[PDB]
């Protein structure tokens, strides 16, 4: 899977 990518999208969203 790609959890990290989703997290980074989550992360990116926060920024």
UniProtKB/Swiss-Prot annotation:
Residues covalently joined to lipid (S-palmitoyl cysteine): 14
Subcellular location as annotated: Cell membrane; Early endosome
Post-translational modification, as annotated: Homologous desensitization of the receptor is mediated by its phosphorylation by beta-adrenergic receptor kinase.
Coiled-coil residue windows: none
Summary of the function given for this chain in its UniProt record: Beta-adrenergic receptors mediate the catecholamine-induced activation of adenylate cyclase through the action of G proteins. This receptor binds epinephrine and norepinephrine with approximately equal affinity. In dorsal pons neurons, involved in the regulation of sleep/wake behaviors.
Family: Belongs to the G-protein coupled receptor 1 family. Adrenergic receptor subfamily. ADRB1 sub-subfamily.
Name of the protein described by the UniProt record: Beta-1 adrenergic receptor
Organism: Meleagris gallopavo (Wild turkey)
Source species taxonomy: Eukaryota, Metazoa, Chordata, Craniata, Vertebrata
Gene: ADRB1
Shown residues in whole-protein numbering: 345 to 359 of 483
């Amino acid at each position: 899977r790609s959890p990290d990518f989703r997290k980074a999208f989550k992360r990116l969203l926060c920024f």
